[PDB]
Write a protein that binds this ligand. Structure first.
Ligand SMILES: [Ca+2]
Ligand SMILES: [Ca+2]
Ligand SMILES: [Ca+2]
Ligand SMILES: [Ca+2]
Ligand SMILES: [Zn+2]
Length: 316
């Protein structure tokens, strides 16, 4: 829509108040013109046709409970866009400022969120397993990082490449959560997963085995479910990424952590310059070693920690 940029205020899924960038033209729309070619949020109105209607509001105030998921989708897409721009110098997911689109209230009782190839889609949850999925900044950044992967390495969504694709999304979703300093942690989806239980989450990067995911290459899932285990075997990479950052001893192998910032520089580099559509875990290891080598030198501590981390999860 063509109109005047302005700022509205609302409340997100967890009840927190925030300012959001809106556009005025008769109504106030959720259209942020301050970032790239824009961030646009749509109402799918409980249907599955996409994208739905650009979200329109009469007074620029978004405190209705129906508004909550739109507020957070719109706001967290802007925070993810800022993370990629400021930290990695990348302009939107394609690197050329592509418009970012999201639809909320997709279907009824839908317990998922996803990047479909052209935009982000978020269900409201059934209210028991999940509350509206856009309330989780790690979930929003996870889905938006799939768009980044799609335009760069192009990892196919199955078997080891799909597991890497998923791990990349959990790593950058977590790094975005630390960037916004929103009670950060190494768990995924804990702000929106099971509102009746405290403490749990969908997946853990610091201890994937907590929920039954593998944390070692010898425990990988080799069946056919979940497209060959893309959400299961990602735990091996997540654990390696946690160790590179934080350090620790895992199955007897000691890793000195080098921190989150270096972790994000090494993996962003591996992702945008060395990973290809069919890369497997062993190729991920070699891409990560080469990336740290490029950035810090072959006899740096950084290269040494990437190697120990992959040795600790059994990836050679
Ligand atoms: Ca309103
Ligand atoms: Ca958190
Ligand atoms: Ca988290
Ligand atoms: Ca919970
Ligand atoms: Zn994913």
């Amino acid at each position: 829509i063509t109109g005047t940029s302005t700022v509205g205020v609302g409340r997100g899924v967890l009840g927190d108040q925030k300012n959001i960038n809106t556009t005025y033209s008769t109504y106030y729309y959720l259209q942020d013109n301050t970032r790239g070619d824009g961030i646009f949020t749509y109402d799918a109105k409980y249907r599955t046709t996409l994208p739905g209607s650009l979200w329109a509001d009469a007074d620029n105030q978004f405190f209705a409970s129906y508004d909550a998921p739109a507020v957070d989708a719109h706001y967290y897409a802007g925070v993810t866009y800022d993370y990629y721009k400021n930290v990695h110098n990348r302009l939107s997911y394609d690197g050329n400022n592509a418009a970012i689109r999201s639809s909320v209230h997709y279907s009824q009782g839908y317990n998922n969120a996803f990047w479909n190839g052209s935009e982000m889609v978020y269900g409201d949850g059934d209210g028991q397993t999940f509350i509206p999925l856009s309330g989780g900044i790690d979930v929003v950044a996870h889905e938006l990082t799939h768009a980044v992967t799609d335009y760069t390495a192009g990892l196919i969504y199955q078997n080891e490449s799909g597991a890497i694709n998923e791990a990349i999304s959990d790593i950058f979703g977590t790094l975005v959560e630390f960037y916004a300093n929103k009670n950060p942690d190494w768990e995924i989806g804990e702000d929106v997963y099971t509102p009746g239980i405290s403490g749990d989450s969908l997946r853990s990067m610091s201890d994937p085995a907590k929920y039954g995911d593998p944390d070692h290459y010898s425990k990988r899932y080799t069946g056919t479910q979940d497209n060959g285990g893309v959400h299961i075997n990602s735990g091996i990479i997540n654990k390696a990424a946690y160790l590179i950052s934080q350090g620790g001893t895992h199955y007897g192998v000691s890793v000195v952590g080098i921190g989150r910032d270096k972790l994000g520089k090494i993996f962003y580099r591996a992702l945008t310059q060395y990973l290809t559509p069919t890369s497997n875990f062993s190729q991920l290891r070699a891409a990560a070693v080469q990336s740290a080598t490029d950035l810090y030198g072959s006899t740096s501590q950084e290269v040494a920690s990437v190697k120990q981390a992959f040795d600790a999860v059994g990836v050679k």
